[PDB]
Amino acid sequence: GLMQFTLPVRLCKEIELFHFDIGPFENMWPGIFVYMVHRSCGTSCFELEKLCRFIMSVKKNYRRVPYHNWKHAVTVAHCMYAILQNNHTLFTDLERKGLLIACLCHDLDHRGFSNSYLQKFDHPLAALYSTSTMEQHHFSQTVSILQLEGHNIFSTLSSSEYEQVLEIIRKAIIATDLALYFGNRKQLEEMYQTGSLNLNNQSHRDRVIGLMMTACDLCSVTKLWPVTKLTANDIYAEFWAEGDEMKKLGIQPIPMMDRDKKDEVPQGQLGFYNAVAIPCYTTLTQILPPTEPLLKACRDNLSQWEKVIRGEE
Ligand SMILES: Cn1ncc(C(=O)N2CCC2)c1C(=O)Nc1ccn2nc(N3CCOCC3)nc2c1
Ligand SMILES: [Mg+2]
Ligand SMILES: [Zn+2]
């Protein structure tokens, strides 16, 4: 109960900032996560014995893929931590519990392949879940780990609080399906402008949490340029592997997945920042003003991709 996690001074300071990189020392990521749960949620939000066993089972269930890996899980949880800490009063105790765990679990057992590749391959998961295929898998995997003897970090919730947090986690994980983000942000955009946005309305709260999950999921575009640039390599390592596998099914990959279009990457990043990233952080900043630093970091990185195209780097 009196056992706090403590970080070194540079991490103690930088972990509070949106652009923090969790670093290359894997053995520190669990401790970083528990630190964030303790400060965001409380030191008695979870039984430390059960949390530690939950964290290590989650880690074991992420795979050795270039991008959709354990580092990504913890990276996405830290962006949620920074959103939650900069918005103290807006979120319930259950939401602060549920959302960090959602973020840690949101890509559980990812194979490095898109929902489209599973469908075209005709993978079993594509028969079990017709839409948001991997995301329904990720929630399934989260429930299974929670049901391992000794892994129920939620045991000392009431019956209804337990059903509520699992529903928060399910919606949060489904919402990381980028196919659903476009419609979600347009709805939130209309509501905010016409003034109908209402945070006591549960269906509105759900939408807001959806956007937060997208914002945390894409947070590589909100880091310092060298982190953004080097993460993009990991993203394309998966994309181009999927493109190879499409060619093996005798399907031409979309340009995103085609290693033969390395040359156009800087222009592909522009479209992604303009069509997805900037709109996401803009609407998030309008709803939660203290998340402005994410939008400013994203615009800085947009400007860096513009410099690469103009040959300046
Ligand atoms: C940075 N970041 N973070 C998350 C994702 C992402 O989409 N998700 C889905 C799972 C992670 C990306 C990303 O890079 N997206 C994209 C999206 C479209 N395009 N289109 C090209 N190009 C077309 C022309 O030819 C060159 C490539 N690159 C990209 C890169
Ligand atoms: Mg995902
Ligand atoms: Zn993800």
User: What single string gives the DSSP state of each residue in 245-313?
Assistant: HHHHTT-PPPGGG-GGGGGGHHHHHHHHIIIIIHHHHHHHHHHSGGGHHHHHHHHHHHHHHHHHHTT--
Where b means 16+ CB within 10 Å and e means fewer, 132-162 reads bbbbbbbbbbbeebbeeeebbbbeebeeeeb
- The experimental resolution of this structure, in angstroms, equals 2.1
Encoding tokens for residue 247?
A: 């060619």
Fold of 28-310: Catalytic domain of cyclic nucleotide phosphodiesterase 4b2b (1.10.1300)
Instruction: Give the residue from 243, 233, 218, 238 showing the smallest Cα distance to 298.
Output: 218
Give yes or no: 204 in active site: no
Atom 22 (ligand 1) nearest CA: 268
Cβ atoms < 10 Å from Cβ of 170: 19
Atom 9 (ligand 1) nearest CA: 178
78 known ligand binder: no
Measured torsion, CA atoms of residues 37, 40, 41, 43, in degrees rounded to the nearest 10: 60
Ligand 3 centroid to residue 204 C-alpha, Å? 23
The number of the ligand nearest the C-alpha atom of 267 reads 1
Q: Is 268 in the pocket of ligand 1 (CB under 6 A)?
A: yes
Q: Which method resolved this structure? A: X-ray
Residue type, 294: L
